[PDB]
Short mmCIF file of C-alpha atoms and ligand atoms in Angstrom, two decimals:
data_model
loop_
_atom_site.label_atom_id
_atom_site.label_comp_id
_atom_site.label_asym_id
_atom_site.label_seq_id
_atom_site.Cartn_x
_atom_site.Cartn_y
_atom_site.Cartn_z
CA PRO A 1 -2.29 5.53 -23.92
CA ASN A 2 -2.26 6.49 -20.17
CA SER A 3 -0.98 3.56 -18.18
CA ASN A 4 -0.50 5.53 -14.96
CA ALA A 5 -2.06 3.34 -12.20
CA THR A 6 -1.97 2.79 -8.46
CA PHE A 7 -3.00 -0.28 -6.58
CA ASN A 8 -4.56 -0.96 -3.21
CA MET A 9 -5.36 -4.01 -1.12
CA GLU A 10 -7.71 -4.04 1.87
CA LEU A 11 -9.33 -6.67 4.14
CA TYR A 12 -13.07 -6.31 4.89
CA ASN A 13 -15.41 -7.57 7.66
CA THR A 14 -17.89 -9.26 5.30
CA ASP A 15 -18.56 -10.01 1.64
CA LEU A 16 -20.46 -6.81 1.12
CA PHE A 17 -17.06 -5.11 1.47
CA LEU A 18 -18.82 -2.17 3.07
CA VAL A 19 -16.51 -1.71 6.10
CA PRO A 20 -12.69 -2.13 6.12
CA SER A 21 -11.34 -4.13 9.00
CA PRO A 22 -9.66 -2.13 11.77
CA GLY A 23 -6.88 -2.45 13.08
CA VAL A 24 -5.45 -5.99 12.52
CA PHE A 25 -7.71 -8.60 11.07
CA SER A 26 -8.31 -11.60 13.30
CA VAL A 27 -8.92 -15.00 11.76
CA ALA A 28 -9.52 -18.58 12.90
CA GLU A 29 -9.87 -21.88 11.12
CA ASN A 30 -13.05 -22.00 9.04
CA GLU A 31 -13.60 -18.24 9.07
CA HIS A 32 -13.56 -16.30 5.82
CA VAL A 33 -11.05 -13.64 4.82
CA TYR A 34 -12.55 -11.02 2.54
CA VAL A 35 -10.07 -9.42 0.16
CA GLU A 36 -10.56 -6.30 -1.97
CA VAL A 37 -7.82 -5.28 -4.40
CA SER A 38 -8.09 -2.37 -6.74
CA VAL A 39 -6.39 -0.40 -9.47
CA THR A 40 -7.02 3.38 -9.92
CA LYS A 41 -6.52 4.49 -13.46
CA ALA A 42 -7.70 6.85 -16.16
CA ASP A 43 -7.88 4.47 -19.12
CA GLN A 44 -10.77 2.10 -19.88
CA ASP A 45 -8.59 -0.29 -21.93
CA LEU A 46 -6.39 -0.74 -18.85
CA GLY A 47 -7.27 -3.66 -16.54
CA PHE A 48 -5.52 -5.65 -13.83
CA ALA A 49 -4.97 -9.20 -12.63
CA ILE A 50 -4.41 -10.82 -9.24
CA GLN A 51 -1.35 -12.80 -10.23
CA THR A 52 -0.62 -14.53 -6.94
CA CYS A 53 -1.83 -14.59 -3.34
CA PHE A 54 -0.40 -16.56 -0.52
CA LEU A 55 -0.11 -16.57 3.21
CA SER A 56 3.03 -16.91 5.34
CA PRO A 57 4.55 -16.22 8.76
CA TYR A 58 6.89 -13.67 7.04
CA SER A 59 6.19 -10.05 6.12
CA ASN A 60 8.79 -10.34 3.35
CA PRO A 61 6.86 -11.72 0.32
CA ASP A 62 10.10 -13.14 -1.20
CA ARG A 63 10.02 -15.92 1.46
CA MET A 64 8.46 -19.17 0.20
CA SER A 65 5.11 -20.62 1.39
CA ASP A 66 3.11 -23.71 0.49
CA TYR A 67 -0.12 -21.88 1.65
CA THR A 68 -1.00 -20.66 -1.81
CA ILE A 69 -4.40 -19.15 -2.60
CA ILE A 70 -3.89 -17.85 -6.14
CA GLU A 71 -1.04 -18.65 -8.55
CA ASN A 72 -0.58 -17.44 -12.15
CA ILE A 73 -4.14 -15.86 -11.85
CA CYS A 74 -5.73 -19.28 -11.26
CA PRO A 75 -7.22 -20.00 -7.77
CA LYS A 76 -5.10 -22.81 -6.24
CA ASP A 77 -6.97 -22.98 -2.89
CA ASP A 78 -10.31 -24.80 -3.22
CA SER A 79 -12.21 -22.29 -1.01
CA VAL A 80 -11.48 -19.20 -3.11
CA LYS A 81 -14.67 -17.49 -4.15
CA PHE A 82 -15.02 -14.39 -6.38
CA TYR A 83 -17.52 -11.68 -5.97
CA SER A 84 -18.56 -9.13 -8.52
CA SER A 85 -16.01 -6.45 -9.39
CA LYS A 86 -17.04 -2.86 -8.72
CA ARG A 87 -15.98 0.21 -10.70
CA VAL A 88 -16.22 3.55 -8.96
CA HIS A 89 -16.13 6.41 -11.42
CA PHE A 90 -14.73 9.90 -10.91
CA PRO A 91 -16.04 11.49 -14.16
CA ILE A 92 -14.39 14.90 -13.68
CA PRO A 93 -10.79 13.59 -13.96
CA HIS A 94 -12.20 10.64 -15.90
CA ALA A 95 -10.71 8.34 -13.33
CA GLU A 96 -11.94 5.09 -11.98
CA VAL A 97 -11.20 2.78 -9.15
CA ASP A 98 -11.64 -0.81 -10.32
CA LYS A 99 -12.16 -3.23 -7.47
CA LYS A 100 -11.85 -7.02 -7.48
CA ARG A 101 -13.24 -8.88 -4.57
CA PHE A 102 -12.78 -12.44 -3.29
CA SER A 103 -12.77 -14.56 -0.19
CA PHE A 104 -11.21 -17.75 1.05
CA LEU A 105 -11.85 -19.90 4.11
CA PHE A 106 -8.89 -19.85 6.44
CA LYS A 107 -7.03 -23.12 6.97
CA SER A 108 -4.84 -24.07 10.00
CA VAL A 109 -1.55 -24.53 8.15
CA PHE A 110 0.70 -22.39 10.37
CA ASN A 111 1.16 -21.97 14.12
CA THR A 112 2.26 -18.34 14.57
CA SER A 113 0.33 -15.48 16.18
CA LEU A 114 0.78 -13.26 13.20
CA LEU A 115 0.57 -14.20 9.54
CA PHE A 116 0.80 -12.18 6.36
CA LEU A 117 -1.38 -12.33 3.26
CA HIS A 118 0.59 -11.27 0.25
CA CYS A 119 -0.98 -10.46 -3.12
CA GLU A 120 0.84 -9.51 -6.30
CA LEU A 121 -1.20 -7.33 -8.75
CA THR A 122 -0.20 -6.69 -12.43
CA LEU A 123 -1.54 -4.46 -15.22
CA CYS A 124 -3.02 -5.85 -18.34
CA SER A 125 -4.72 -4.74 -21.52
CA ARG A 126 -8.51 -5.12 -22.04
CA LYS A 127 -8.21 -4.64 -25.81
CA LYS A 128 -5.58 -5.61 -28.42
CA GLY A 129 -4.35 -2.11 -29.35
CA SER A 130 -1.81 0.66 -28.67
CA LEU A 131 -1.56 -0.43 -24.99
CA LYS A 132 1.65 -2.52 -24.51
CA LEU A 133 0.81 -5.11 -21.89
CA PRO A 134 -0.45 -8.68 -21.73
CA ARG A 135 -4.17 -9.25 -22.36
CA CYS A 136 -6.34 -9.54 -19.26
CA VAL A 137 -7.30 -13.17 -18.65
CA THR A 138 -10.08 -14.17 -16.24
CA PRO A 139 -9.34 -16.49 -13.29
CA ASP A 140 -11.36 -19.35 -14.89
CA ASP A 141 -9.47 -18.92 -18.18
CA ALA A 142 -6.17 -18.93 -16.30
CA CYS A 143 -7.01 -22.28 -14.72
CA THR A 144 -7.75 -23.74 -18.13
CA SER A 145 -4.27 -22.54 -19.27
CA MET A 146 3.15 -16.52 -18.60
CA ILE A 147 4.61 -13.11 -19.55
CA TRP A 148 6.87 -10.89 -17.44
CA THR A 149 5.25 -7.65 -16.28
CA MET A 150 7.68 -4.79 -15.66
CA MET A 151 8.26 -3.44 -12.14
CA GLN A 152 6.23 -0.20 -12.51
CA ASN A 153 3.27 -2.24 -13.73
CA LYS A 154 2.99 -4.54 -10.73
CA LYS A 155 3.04 -4.33 -6.99
CA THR A 156 2.92 -6.71 -4.10
CA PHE A 157 0.87 -5.85 -1.04
CA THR A 158 0.99 -7.56 2.30
CA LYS A 159 -1.67 -7.42 5.09
CA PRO A 160 -1.24 -8.69 8.57
CA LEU A 161 -3.54 -11.24 10.23
CA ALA A 162 -3.78 -12.33 13.87
CA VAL A 163 -4.57 -15.82 15.00
CA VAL A 164 -5.38 -17.22 18.45
CA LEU A 165 -3.03 -20.19 18.96
CA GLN A 166 -4.55 -23.57 20.05
CA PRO B 1 14.32 -9.70 17.47
CA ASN B 2 11.25 -9.71 15.16
CA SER B 3 11.53 -7.23 12.33
CA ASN B 4 8.43 -8.50 10.52
CA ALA B 5 6.30 -5.44 9.72
CA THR B 6 3.72 -4.28 7.24
CA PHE B 7 2.97 -0.69 6.23
CA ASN B 8 -0.11 1.24 5.15
CA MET B 9 -0.71 4.69 3.81
CA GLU B 10 -4.10 6.34 3.94
CA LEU B 11 -5.45 9.80 3.24
CA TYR B 12 -8.15 11.37 5.41
CA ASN B 13 -10.51 14.31 5.41
CA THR B 14 -9.41 16.39 8.43
CA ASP B 15 -6.85 16.57 11.19
CA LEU B 16 -9.13 14.10 13.08
CA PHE B 17 -8.23 11.16 10.85
CA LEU B 18 -11.73 9.77 11.24
CA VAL B 19 -13.05 9.22 7.68
CA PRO B 20 -10.95 7.58 4.98
CA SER B 21 -11.08 9.40 1.75
CA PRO B 22 -12.49 8.04 -1.51
CA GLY B 23 -10.20 6.26 -3.94
CA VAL B 24 -9.15 9.51 -5.62
CA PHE B 25 -8.45 12.38 -3.28
CA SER B 26 -9.48 15.86 -4.47
CA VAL B 27 -6.97 18.67 -4.01
CA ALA B 28 -6.82 22.35 -4.73
CA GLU B 29 -4.54 25.29 -4.12
CA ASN B 30 -4.07 26.22 -0.46
CA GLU B 31 -6.14 23.16 0.62
CA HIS B 32 -4.90 20.44 3.01
CA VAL B 33 -3.87 16.89 2.50
CA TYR B 34 -3.99 14.76 5.68
CA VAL B 35 -1.83 11.61 5.60
CA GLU B 36 -1.62 8.71 7.96
CA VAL B 37 1.05 6.11 7.55
CA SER B 38 1.10 3.06 9.76
CA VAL B 39 3.25 0.15 10.77
CA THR B 40 1.97 -3.15 12.13
CA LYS B 41 4.70 -5.13 13.91
CA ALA B 42 5.50 -7.26 16.91
CA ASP B 43 8.56 -5.65 18.51
CA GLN B 44 8.38 -2.61 20.76
CA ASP B 45 11.97 -1.73 19.80
CA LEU B 46 11.11 -1.47 16.09
CA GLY B 47 9.98 1.95 14.76
CA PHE B 48 9.61 3.54 11.33
CA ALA B 49 10.24 6.83 9.67
CA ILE B 50 8.77 8.67 6.71
CA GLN B 51 11.96 8.94 4.74
CA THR B 52 10.72 10.86 1.71
CA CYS B 53 7.45 12.11 0.21
CA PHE B 54 6.91 13.94 -3.03
CA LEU B 55 4.18 14.69 -5.54
CA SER B 56 4.39 14.20 -9.25
CA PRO B 57 2.27 13.64 -12.38
CA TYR B 58 3.55 10.04 -12.62
CA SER B 59 2.42 6.94 -10.77
CA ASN B 60 5.96 5.57 -11.20
CA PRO B 61 7.86 6.75 -8.08
CA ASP B 62 11.18 6.40 -10.04
CA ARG B 63 10.45 9.61 -11.91
CA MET B 64 11.62 12.40 -9.66
CA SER B 65 9.84 15.67 -9.22
CA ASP B 66 10.93 18.97 -7.78
CA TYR B 67 7.81 18.96 -5.52
CA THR B 68 9.34 17.33 -2.50
CA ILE B 69 7.71 17.68 0.84
CA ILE B 70 9.74 15.38 3.15
CA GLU B 71 13.33 14.47 2.34
CA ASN B 72 15.67 12.28 4.51
CA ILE B 73 13.00 12.48 7.26
CA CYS B 74 13.11 16.32 7.37
CA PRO B 75 10.11 18.32 6.22
CA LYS B 76 11.37 20.40 3.25
CA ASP B 77 7.96 22.10 2.74
CA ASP B 78 7.12 24.81 5.34
CA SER B 79 3.50 23.70 5.34
CA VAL B 80 4.25 20.25 6.68
CA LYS B 81 2.79 19.71 10.11
CA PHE B 82 2.99 16.51 12.19
CA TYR B 83 0.30 15.43 14.66
CA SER B 84 0.22 13.21 17.72
CA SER B 85 1.10 9.63 16.76
CA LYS B 86 -1.27 6.80 17.80
CA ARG B 87 -0.15 3.41 19.16
CA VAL B 88 -2.59 0.54 19.45
CA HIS B 89 -1.52 -2.57 21.31
CA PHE B 90 -2.98 -6.06 20.82
CA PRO B 91 -1.93 -8.26 23.70
CA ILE B 92 -3.25 -11.57 22.48
CA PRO B 93 -0.88 -11.98 19.47
CA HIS B 94 1.59 -9.45 20.94
CA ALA B 95 1.30 -6.93 18.10
CA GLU B 96 1.06 -3.23 17.76
CA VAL B 97 -0.02 -0.69 15.19
CA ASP B 98 1.79 2.62 15.25
CA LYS B 99 0.44 5.49 13.19
CA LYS B 100 2.18 8.64 12.18
CA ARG B 101 0.07 11.54 10.94
CA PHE B 102 0.82 14.68 9.03
CA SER B 103 -0.60 17.30 6.73
CA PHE B 104 0.58 19.63 4.07
CA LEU B 105 -0.98 22.44 2.03
CA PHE B 106 -1.25 21.64 -1.69
CA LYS B 107 0.33 23.89 -4.20
CA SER B 108 -0.63 23.59 -7.79
CA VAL B 109 2.62 23.54 -9.80
CA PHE B 110 1.84 20.95 -12.47
CA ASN B 111 -0.62 21.23 -15.31
CA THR B 112 -2.14 17.76 -15.01
CA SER B 113 -5.45 16.85 -13.39
CA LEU B 114 -4.28 13.55 -11.97
CA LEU B 115 -1.29 13.59 -9.60
CA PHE B 116 0.40 11.15 -7.28
CA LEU B 117 1.68 11.43 -3.73
CA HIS B 118 4.63 9.06 -3.21
CA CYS B 119 6.01 8.26 0.28
CA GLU B 120 8.87 6.01 1.14
CA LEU B 121 8.84 4.40 4.62
CA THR B 122 11.88 2.80 6.36
CA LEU B 123 12.30 0.75 9.57
CA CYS B 124 14.45 1.95 12.42
CA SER B 125 15.46 1.01 15.89
CA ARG B 126 14.03 2.70 19.00
CA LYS B 127 16.83 1.54 21.25
CA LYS B 128 20.49 0.80 20.51
CA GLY B 129 20.54 -2.99 20.45
CA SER B 130 19.70 -6.14 18.43
CA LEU B 131 18.05 -4.43 15.41
CA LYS B 132 20.60 -3.86 12.57
CA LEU B 133 18.72 -0.79 11.51
CA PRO B 134 19.50 2.81 11.88
CA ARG B 135 18.30 4.68 15.02
CA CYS B 136 14.89 6.39 14.83
CA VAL B 137 15.07 10.15 14.59
CA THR B 138 12.24 12.69 14.80
CA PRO B 139 11.45 14.98 11.87
CA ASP B 140 12.65 18.08 13.75
CA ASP B 141 15.85 16.31 14.77
CA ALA B 142 16.37 15.28 11.17
CA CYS B 143 16.06 18.91 10.15
CA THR B 144 18.58 20.23 12.58
CA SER B 145 21.05 17.31 12.54
CA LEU B 146 24.41 17.83 10.85
CA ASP B 147 24.98 14.01 11.13
CA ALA B 148 25.38 12.86 7.47
CA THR B 149 25.26 9.18 8.26
CA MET B 150 22.41 9.08 10.81
CA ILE B 151 20.19 7.72 8.12
CA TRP B 152 21.17 4.66 6.17
CA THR B 153 19.72 1.59 4.53
CA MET B 154 20.97 -1.96 3.92
CA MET B 155 17.91 -2.64 1.75
CA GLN B 156 18.50 -1.60 -1.90
CA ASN B 157 14.72 -2.19 -2.46
CA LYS B 158 12.52 -0.43 0.19
CA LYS B 159 8.85 0.33 0.85
CA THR B 160 7.00 2.92 -1.22
CA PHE B 161 3.32 3.82 -1.35
CA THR B 162 1.51 5.97 -3.88
CA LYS B 163 -1.94 7.66 -3.60
CA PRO B 164 -3.81 9.29 -6.50
CA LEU B 165 -4.96 12.95 -6.37
CA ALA B 166 -7.31 14.85 -8.59
CA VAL B 167 -6.64 18.54 -9.04
CA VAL B 168 -10.08 20.08 -9.12
CA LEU B 169 -8.82 22.92 -11.22
CA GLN B 170 -12.14 24.73 -11.85
C1 LIG C 201 1.31 9.41 -16.90
O1 LIG C 201 0.72 10.67 -17.02
C2 LIG C 201 1.53 11.74 -17.49
C3 LIG C 201 0.59 12.93 -17.51
O2 LIG C 201 -0.35 12.65 -18.54
C4 LIG C 201 -1.49 13.50 -18.57
O3 LIG C 201 -1.48 14.28 -19.68
C5 LIG C 201 -2.06 13.61 -20.84
C6 LIG C 201 -1.17 12.59 -21.51
C7 LIG C 201 -3.43 13.00 -20.53
O4 LIG C 201 -3.36 11.62 -20.48
C8 LIG C 201 -3.78 13.55 -19.16
O5 LIG C 201 -5.10 13.30 -18.89
C9 LIG C 201 -2.81 13.04 -18.09
O6 LIG C 201 -3.26 13.44 -16.81
C10 LIG C 201 2.07 11.39 -18.89
O7 LIG C 201 2.89 12.43 -19.32
C11 LIG C 201 2.36 13.11 -20.47
O8 LIG C 201 2.50 12.37 -21.68
C12 LIG C 201 1.85 13.03 -22.76
C13 LIG C 201 1.95 12.21 -24.05
O9 LIG C 201 1.59 10.86 -23.87
C14 LIG C 201 2.54 14.37 -23.00
O10 LIG C 201 1.75 14.96 -24.00
C15 LIG C 201 2.02 16.34 -24.29
O11 LIG C 201 1.41 17.22 -23.35
C16 LIG C 201 1.73 18.59 -23.57
C17 LIG C 201 1.35 19.43 -22.33
O12 LIG C 201 2.51 19.94 -21.63
C18 LIG C 201 2.61 19.59 -20.21
O13 LIG C 201 1.58 18.82 -19.62
C19 LIG C 201 1.91 18.33 -18.30
C20 LIG C 201 0.88 17.19 -18.10
O14 LIG C 201 0.02 17.34 -16.99
C21 LIG C 201 2.11 19.47 -17.22
O15 LIG C 201 2.50 19.21 -15.80
C22 LIG C 201 3.03 20.53 -17.89
O16 LIG C 201 3.16 21.71 -17.10
C23 LIG C 201 2.59 20.84 -19.34
O17 LIG C 201 1.25 21.23 -19.39
C24 LIG C 201 0.99 18.98 -24.84
O18 LIG C 201 1.29 20.33 -25.20
C25 LIG C 201 1.33 18.07 -26.05
O19 LIG C 201 0.37 18.37 -27.11
C26 LIG C 201 -0.05 17.33 -28.04
O20 LIG C 201 0.99 16.58 -28.66
C27 LIG C 201 0.49 15.45 -29.36
C28 LIG C 201 1.64 14.54 -29.77
O21 LIG C 201 2.49 15.20 -30.68
C29 LIG C 201 -0.37 15.93 -30.54
O22 LIG C 201 -0.94 14.84 -31.22
C30 LIG C 201 -1.49 16.84 -30.01
O23 LIG C 201 -2.20 17.44 -31.06
C31 LIG C 201 -0.92 17.95 -29.14
O24 LIG C 201 -0.16 18.84 -29.93
C32 LIG C 201 1.47 16.57 -25.69
O25 LIG C 201 0.22 15.89 -25.76
C33 LIG C 201 2.54 15.18 -21.73
O26 LIG C 201 3.36 16.33 -21.82
C34 LIG C 201 3.16 14.37 -20.61
N1 LIG C 201 3.10 15.08 -19.36
C35 LIG C 201 4.10 15.18 -18.45
C36 LIG C 201 3.77 15.92 -17.18
O27 LIG C 201 5.20 14.64 -18.57
C37 LIG C 201 2.83 10.08 -18.79
O28 LIG C 201 3.18 9.53 -20.03
C38 LIG C 201 4.57 9.09 -20.02
O29 LIG C 201 5.52 10.14 -19.94
C39 LIG C 201 5.47 11.12 -20.98
C40 LIG C 201 6.56 12.18 -20.82
C41 LIG C 201 5.59 10.46 -22.35
O30 LIG C 201 6.91 10.00 -22.46
C42 LIG C 201 4.63 9.31 -22.50
O31 LIG C 201 4.94 8.58 -23.65
C43 LIG C 201 4.79 8.34 -21.32
O32 LIG C 201 3.81 7.32 -21.39
C44 LIG C 201 1.86 9.02 -18.23
N2 LIG C 201 2.60 7.81 -18.05
C45 LIG C 201 2.28 6.62 -18.54
C46 LIG C 201 3.21 5.46 -18.24
O33 LIG C 201 1.27 6.45 -19.19
C1 LIG C 202 9.20 -13.08 11.21
O1 LIG C 202 8.36 -13.93 11.90
C2 LIG C 202 8.77 -15.23 12.31
C3 LIG C 202 8.42 -15.18 13.82
O2 LIG C 202 7.85 -16.39 14.06
C4 LIG C 202 7.17 -16.52 15.34
O3 LIG C 202 5.92 -15.87 15.27
C5 LIG C 202 5.88 -14.48 15.55
C6 LIG C 202 4.41 -14.04 15.65
C7 LIG C 202 6.55 -14.16 16.89
O4 LIG C 202 5.79 -14.69 17.93
C8 LIG C 202 7.96 -14.72 17.00
O5 LIG C 202 8.38 -14.66 18.33
C9 LIG C 202 7.98 -16.18 16.60
O6 LIG C 202 9.36 -16.54 16.48
C10 LIG C 202 10.29 -15.51 12.25
O7 LIG C 202 10.42 -16.89 11.99
C11 LIG C 202 10.75 -17.59 13.22
O8 LIG C 202 12.05 -17.31 13.71
C12 LIG C 202 12.45 -17.98 14.89
C13 LIG C 202 13.87 -17.55 15.30
O9 LIG C 202 13.86 -16.16 15.52
C14 LIG C 202 12.44 -19.48 14.74
O10 LIG C 202 12.34 -20.03 16.04
C15 LIG C 202 13.50 -20.52 16.78
O11 LIG C 202 14.80 -20.46 16.16
C16 LIG C 202 15.75 -20.79 17.18
C17 LIG C 202 17.11 -20.11 17.03
O12 LIG C 202 17.67 -19.96 18.34
C18 LIG C 202 15.82 -22.30 17.16
O13 LIG C 202 16.76 -22.77 18.13
C19 LIG C 202 14.44 -22.89 17.45
O14 LIG C 202 14.31 -24.04 16.61
C20 LIG C 202 13.22 -21.94 17.28
O15 LIG C 202 12.25 -22.54 16.39
C21 LIG C 202 11.09 -19.86 14.16
O16 LIG C 202 10.96 -21.28 13.97
C22 LIG C 202 10.75 -19.05 12.89
N1 LIG C 202 9.42 -19.42 12.50
C23 LIG C 202 9.10 -19.74 11.26
C24 LIG C 202 7.65 -20.10 11.09
O17 LIG C 202 9.92 -19.74 10.35
C25 LIG C 202 11.06 -14.70 11.24
O18 LIG C 202 12.42 -14.56 11.51
C26 LIG C 202 13.26 -15.04 10.42
O19 LIG C 202 13.33 -16.26 9.73
C27 LIG C 202 13.59 -17.35 10.64
C28 LIG C 202 13.41 -18.68 9.92
C29 LIG C 202 14.94 -17.18 11.33
O20 LIG C 202 15.91 -17.32 10.33
C30 LIG C 202 15.10 -15.79 11.92
O21 LIG C 202 16.43 -15.55 12.22
C31 LIG C 202 14.69 -14.74 10.89
O22 LIG C 202 14.68 -13.50 11.52
C32 LIG C 202 10.69 -13.26 11.45
N2 LIG C 202 11.33 -12.45 10.39
C33 LIG C 202 12.01 -11.33 10.69
C34 LIG C 202 12.57 -10.51 9.58
O23 LIG C 202 12.17 -10.99 11.86
#
């Protein structure tokens, strides 16, 4: 099976995810952050999961934060809302871009002008078969319930955010 | 010194870098690929370089390919052309976005319809001083320099981005 895949993460102005934010996304307490993550692939049995998302004052995602949004696929922040996924098909190379979309309502946890939203994405299998990967599990099913995904099958992305300090 | 920084890589339609390209970028022989790579940061003394870029039939950037277009900052492919960089400054949170822009001409040397463009970005220092990073060097300077240790890392895991390409083929 073809498990070649690339991932992307982008912030958007609204929950129609029509227009990507230029240049650095500004946020304030009780404004929404709109997050689109995607995998581009050429195998229908191949899916992905948003393993973890969290914010911190550090671009390096190895640094610890207690501002967790998603953890082990389950939403940990109470404001996280999912939108429908969107699959864009490129039938000539039989490729598709599979997009997952969510938002959260920004909380005043930190006090730095710039913050970083870090999301870790991992590949999974949509169908018990010749694809060697954990089965895709929905966010709701994660919460009502933890295998190691190999480095080429996962990626962390980090987007910057600007905040006006009070 | 603040060496916090995030990177982006985006493909575009022309040398104007106006319209981002769809999720899979179509290529063909003798046609252009326009690439913009950016850093967002909060230190005027911090810069970045495009260390290496190559194309291959594998999404895994560990698998090397003989189709290398930039190596150790120097353009190895004669088609590579750099354009005016853009620098946007945001005074409220004291941040800046610096964009580097380049193009190459695709050559079709694989026999797969889906390819991947891999670029590795590294941080550098614009001024000798507090950043424990190598000095920034321009692509042309990197091509002419006989300084073997100009370029170094202390990182052991550094920043790579990969963009999918479809080779139109027919
Ligand atoms: C990521 O993608 C690459 C490219 O895959 C493409 O090609 C196939 C698989 C199809 O999915 C395409 O739509 C993709 O775009 C994977 O590498 C490829 O792996 C396949 C086997 O899984 C292997 O298959 C042989 O292909 C021969 C063609 O020769 C070359 O093709 C490449 C590919 O673009 C060119 O650049 C070359 O110039 C040259 O054309 C076929 O002749 C051969 O024929 C069949 O053999 C089978 C098996 O015996 C038999 O049943 C049939 O009847 C035929 O006789 C094979 O099918 C490709 O050669 C290989 N391509 C390259 C460029 O390496 C890659 O898979 C990973 O790496 C390869 C080397 C294997 O180790 C895979 O097991 C491994 O997964 C894939 N990566 C991942 C992680 O999925
Ligand atoms: C990445 O960002 C953080 C910068 O934090 C602040 O916000 C940004 C927007 C910018 O305005 C910076 O000017 C601000 O500092 C860094 O974390 C901060 O680091 C500073 C020290 O550089 C620390 O503040 C001071 O530390 C001095 C030491 O003289 C101490 O006497 C004071 O107590 C004073 O607080 C901040 O508290 C710290 N902020 C947080 C939220 O942790 C971060 O730098 C790195 O990690 C910190 C903890 C220190 O170890 C730094 O040495 C280390 O670089 C920045 N990361 C990088 C890679 O630059």
